[PDB]
Amino acid sequence: VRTIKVFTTVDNINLHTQVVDMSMTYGQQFGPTYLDGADVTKIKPHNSHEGKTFYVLPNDDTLRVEAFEYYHTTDPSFLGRYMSALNHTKKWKYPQVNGLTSIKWADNNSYLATALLTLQQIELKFNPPALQDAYYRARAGEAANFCALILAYCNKTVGELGDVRETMSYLFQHANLDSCKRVLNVVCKTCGQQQTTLKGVEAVMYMGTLSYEQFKKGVQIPCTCGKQATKYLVQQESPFVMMSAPPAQYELKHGTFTCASEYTGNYQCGHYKHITSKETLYCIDGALLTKSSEYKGPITDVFYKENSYTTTIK
Ligand SMILES: C[C@H](c1cccc2ccccc12)N(C)Cc1c[nH]c2ccccc12
Numbered sequence: 001v002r003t004i005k006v007f008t009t010v011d012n013i014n015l016h017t018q019v020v021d022m023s024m025t026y027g028q029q030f031g032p033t034y035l036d037g038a039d040v041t042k043i044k045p046h047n048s049h050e051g052k053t054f055y056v057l058p059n060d061d062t063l064r065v066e067a068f069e070y071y072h073t074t075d076p077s078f079l080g081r082y083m084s085a086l087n088h089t090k091k092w093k094y095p096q097v098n099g100l101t102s103i104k105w106a107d108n109n110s111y112l113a114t115a116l117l118t119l120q121q122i123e124l125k126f127n128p129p130a131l132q133d134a135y136y137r138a139r140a141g142e143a144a145n146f147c148a149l150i151l152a153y154c155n156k157t158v159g160e161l162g163d164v165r166e167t168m169s170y171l172f173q174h175a176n177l178d179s180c181k182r183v184l185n186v187v188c189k190t191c192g193q194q195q196t197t198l199k200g201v202e203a204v205m206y207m208g209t210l211s212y213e214q215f216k217k218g219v220q221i222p223c224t225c226g227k228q229a230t231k232y233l234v235q236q237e238s239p240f241v242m243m244s245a246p247p248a249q250y251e252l253k254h255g256t257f258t259c260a261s262e263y264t265g266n267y268q269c270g271h272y273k274h275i276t277s278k279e280t281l282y283c284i285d286g287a288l289l290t291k292s293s294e295y296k297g298p299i300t301d302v303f304y305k306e307n308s309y310t311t312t313i314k
């Protein structure tokens with residue numbers, strides 16, 4: 001009966017020394033077991049595994065508390081889905097483009113690259129240590145854990161096409177946006193006026209207009225009475241806002257926005273690029289950079305900086 005010592009973990013923070021029997025598979029001793037994202041459940045220990053860290057499923061109360069404190073989910077499939085994604089994302093390339101960590105195109109990942117670039121330019125604090133830790137690694141040029149976590153949190157698999165807005169909506173649920181506040185006023189000539197207050201994620205996302213300036217002046221929306229009403233922004237307290245709309249030709253102007261999602265294609269099949277405003281306009285398309293003084297193209301999300309806005313409309 002020969003043995004080696006290894007560490008098991010659910011979080012890569014808390015390591016648990018195990019003595020393993022070299023004549024049994026990891027799966028027989030631990031249940032589902034991963035080594036650097038690879039599924040080694042049906043593999044027998046190797047002398048070179050001595051002192052290495054293996055991920056296991058949280059199969060006791062100690063490991064369940066550790067997994068919940070790290071990932072902020074009790075979903076028992078999570079660790080498995082993370083590890084399966086990570087097995088592929090650790091093989092992607094993470095180009096430095098204009099001081100930002102991007103992703104070289106692979107496995108329909110344009111929506112993920114656009115989300116990754118966006119997250120480096122808006123002010124957001126994630127609540128799960130897993131997302132905070134992986135975000136810092138992605139900033140340091142190694143975004144594999146961060147991309148695999150995004151896929152697991154969004155219940156998406158490597159290879160699937162995706163929507164930046166839906167990705168941002170899920171990630172914003174795991175961010176501290178509690179103090180974000182939005183006040184709206186809607187004016188219908190038939191129904192009269194309606195003031196509402198939104199908090200949290202709803203306070204920073206809007207669907208139907210790209211222009212923050214037009215949101216402040218008033219946008220036309222369908223009223224429940226079948227007429228068009230005017231909705232405008234009374235008050236915003238947030239460090240950014242995200243303005244989305246079905247893709248349409250749109251002019252982006254240097255210095256008037258943080259960054260933007262360009263989308264070419266249809267609802268099922270298409271490709272994202274990312275536009276960012278620095279000293280001029282940069283278009284980042286995975287590894288590919290192109291720069292211009294002006295931009296006109298199919299835009300679906302625009303991000304703006306904010307702190308505190310109050311309308312002067314009385
Ligand atoms: C930007 C785009 C989109 C958003 C909203 C309205 C649109 C209308 C026409 C064409 C595209 C539209 N996403 C990716 C499509 C999309 C949404 N959810 C998805 C889930 C998987 C794959 C693609 C998608």
Ligand SMILES: [Cl-]
Pocket residue numbers: 108109110111270271272
């Ligand atoms: Cl793509």
Ligand SMILES: [Cl-]
Pocket residue numbers: 124125126131132135
């Ligand atoms: Cl963070």
Ligand SMILES: [Zn+2]
Pocket residue numbers: 188189190191192223224225226227229
């Ligand atoms: Zn009305």
